[PDB]
Design a protein around this ligand. Structure first.
Ligand SMILES: COc1cccc2[nH]c(C(=O)N[C@@H](CC(C)C)C(=O)N[C@@H](C[C@@H]3CCNC3=O)C(=O)c3nc4ccccc4s3)cc12
Ligand SMILES: COc1cccc2[nH]c(C(=O)N[C@@H](CC(C)C)C(=O)N[C@@H](C[C@@H]3CCNC3=O)C(=O)c3nc4ccccc4s3)cc12
Lengths: 298, 298
């Protein structure tokens, strides 16, 4: 069982470089639109608070240097959408795939194409956390990198990188420029809400461990959903919904362990702890491996 | 802020095709006017237990190879075996052919895998060639012919093509010249690898990664000689350290400011006293699938 990313070629054909003054970041080229974080226009204005509507009226189309590989693209118009700029260019991307813009929900995963200077350097898998952060790997120059999923040749773009919190996690927006979480694009230290554990995915991981022949943690206690949810919240675990219990159906049928019986297993692990025991090799319960991942890889 | 990252797969995705002989369908790699694929695409369910490839191949003509690149079908105009691969000559040269080389990777080195099913890429992940010449991959039915690769600049270095899953769940395959890594043969039999060991040079590089990411709890005032460390390493199934390895860890040592043999003393302490419930870079186990080169790049 291992975390896999979606193949990145459909997105690589869209990455570009957007430069204002001495500041440059990544943008996404779809048809005749380039999307990028709006703070490419900042010149130290980012410190404290920038007035984006003022900075933007003060900018000409010629001040935007947009480069796709070797080619410079002429900016024909610009308008601001939330925390993103939409740049109109004179040529439509010959490599635009079928795409949509989606708002990823907590607990769901996506692939990140980390880019620097409009050039992709790496691909990895991420989870949107309940507190609306992601545990990414992003260095200076990463802003504008996108997260995405791919279904039947259609790219679902769900994220654009904007910032790294003081704790080392990362924050950003969907492709309409709406931030995930309560963060704002200014140069300030910001704090995320307490980060809860994705219970649906821990449970999925437990199911994967049982499929792997590792079942020391099972027991014969019973729990109701309500009584499991009250214990889980005491340990900063997300409560389980009835939809989540359904999502776990195929895995519970495959192993013969009823979902609520696995909850009774997890409940004991929360209350008694691992005690040095290991699950799939780790003393830590993994929560970024989804039931879909377990299902596909079993 | 540190994780396994795979190379962007775009240059490789544009080379994946589908090769069919009768009921059997495998992935193939299309470079210039040649398609490479595992030779047991010519196998029926009855030839698999102990087939004679020379015999089975003399019995086929170019017409019996249906090669599909996406929608398009390419005509085979010639064929030949190279070890455990077939090389099919096609009438059209792949216009998406990247700059490339064929290399044979040595144990401990890492690469990216593009997992393909029915000629179409489905996932990408990073993995390393184990000391016992297997890879700990994620390969399902229909994955044979998927390739492993590294990218330097704009040149794809192909190093792996996938053939088989051992009963232990690890995987075996060949370089692009069709020569298998390890003691394995392409037959439908249960085969065993040698006993695996831990890649010491990679654990050390990962410990440097942790120090560079601000995880220094495991460090200690002590130091050890290479010989002393090796005696300890042998006890815990770790590859012996070599002076060349220490030279490879030169640059990491300089940035960190920690002498290599100091890091070894820390590792000796982690082997002997465990991690005490502590985690390094978010992991409860000593990661050994990051090379010194990988840590630098990130
Ligand atoms: C340590 O806590 C802090 C305390 C006090 C202040 C702090 N600010 C930030 C913060 O993150 N600022 C944002 C930018 C703001 C405007 C959203 C930022 O630098 N984003 C990066 C990606 C970051 C960097 C490392 N990996 C992450 O992904 C991005 O490449 C961009 N670069 C530039 C460079 C020039 C112009 C625009 C951009 S936009 C953290 C922080
Ligand atoms: C007594 O038999 C066993 C006993 C104990 C363990 C065992 N392992 C294997 C074994 O691996 N066989 C090879 C094939 C051999 C001949 C190279 C095989 O099926 N490879 C797969 C990838 C495999 C499949 C599951 N995940 C892995 O990645 C592959 O994608 C290919 N598929 C086909 C399908 C039809 C025709 C050709 C090919 S080539 C057999 C076996």
């Amino acid at each position: 069982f291992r975390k896999m990313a979606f193949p990145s070629g459909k997105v690589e054909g869209c990455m570009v470089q957007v430069t204002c003054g001495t500041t440059t970041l990544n943008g996404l080229w779809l048809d005749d639109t380039v999307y990028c974080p709006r703070h490419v226009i900042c010149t130290a204005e980012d410190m404290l608070n920038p007035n984006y509507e003022d900075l933007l009226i003060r900018k000409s189309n010629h001040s935007f240097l947009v480069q796709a590989g070797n080619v410079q693209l002429r900016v024909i118009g610009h308008s601001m959408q939330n925390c993103l700029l939409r740049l109109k260019v004179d040529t439509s991307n010959p490599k635009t795939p079928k795409y949509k813009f989606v708002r990823i929900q907590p607990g769901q995963t996506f692939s990140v194409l980390a880019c620097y200077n409009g050039s992709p350097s790496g691909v990895y898998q991420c989870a949107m956390r309940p507190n609306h952060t992601i545990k990414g790997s992003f260095l200076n120059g990463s802003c504008g990198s996108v997260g995405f999923n791919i279904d039947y040749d259609c790219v679902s773009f769900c994220y654009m990188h904007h910032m790294e919190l003081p704790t080392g996690v990362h924050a950003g927006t969907d492709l309409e420029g709406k931030f995930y979480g309560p963060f704002v694009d200014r140069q300030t230290a910001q704090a995320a809400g307490t980060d809860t554990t994705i219970t649906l995915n821990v449970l999925a991981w437990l199911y994967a461990a049982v499929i792997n022949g590792d079942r020391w943690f099972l027991n014969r206690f019973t729990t109701t959903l309500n009584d499991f949810n009250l214990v889980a919240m005491k340990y900063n675990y997300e409560p389980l919904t009835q939809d989540h219990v359904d999502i776990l159906g195929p895995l519970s049928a495959q192993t013969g362990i009823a979902v609520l019986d696995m909850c009774a297993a997890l409940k004991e692990l929360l209350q008694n702890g691992m005690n040095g025991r290991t699950i799939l090799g780790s003393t830590i319960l993994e929560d970024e491996f989804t039931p879909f991942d377990v299902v596909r890889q079993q």
